């Protein structure tokens, strides 16, 4: 039995931690909603 609990407001934070790269990938999406890499 699943239940939900509030965790916060949805707002942009000024000076949030900035990280992560920006990869450009060729991908395929199957009927089950799974993404896979295309090579």
């Amino acid at each position: 039995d699943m239940y939900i609990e509030r965790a916060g407001d949805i707002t942009w934070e000024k000076d949030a931690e900035v990280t992560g790269n920006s990869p450009r990938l060729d991908v395929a999406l199957d009927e089950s909603g799974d993404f896979s890499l295309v090579e």
Binding site: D1, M2, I4, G8, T11, W12, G20, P23, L25, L37
Partner: protein, 156 residues
């Protein structure tokens, strides 16, 4: 139950203790999450019940109490923020420049940030605080790193 707009954890007591299986967005009286978090099951909010209203396994999305309301889109140029809500940890904003998933049916923004599976459904936002999609359906790339699509639904 609580109907205030915002980000919520999705919990279960079926397993050991209380386990966080995902996250979602309450907006305009509708609860929005990824299909793989709830498998389309009903949810509880205090003494209230949220019934599924729309869902699609291929898009990996589901809405409760009404139709999908989120329609903002990544502009293809700017940094966005993942409002990560990890299991047992406070909601935290992470800023990043999305990459791209190129598919036979068009291109989708993607965020290269790696959080526990229970963070699925966390919202990705633009600089106006609008939800441009949900985090948690993606792929594991060459060096073992996780990259999530920015998954957004259609507002009918």
């Amino acid at each position: 139950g609580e109907t205030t707009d915002g980000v919520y954890r999705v919990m279960t007591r079926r397993l050991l203790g209380s386990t966080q299986v995902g996250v979602g967005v309450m907006q305009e009286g509708v609860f929005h999450t990824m299909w793989h978090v709830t498998k389309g099951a009903a949810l509880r909010s205090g003494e209230g019940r949220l019934d599924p209203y729309w869902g699609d396994v291929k898009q990996d999305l589901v809405s409760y109490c009404g139709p999908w309301k989120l329609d903002a889109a990544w502009d293809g140029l700017s940094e966005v923020q993942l409002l990560a809500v990890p299991p047992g940890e406070r909601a935290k904003n992470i800023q990043t420049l999305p990459g791209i998933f190129k598919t036979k049916d068009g291109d989708i923004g993607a965020v290269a940030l790696d959080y526990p599976a229970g963070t699925s459904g966390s919202p990705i936002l633009d600089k106006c605080g609008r939800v441009i999609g949900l985090y948690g359906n993606g792929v594991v790339i060459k060096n073992g790193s996780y990259v999530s699509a920015i998954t957004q639904g259609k507002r009918e």
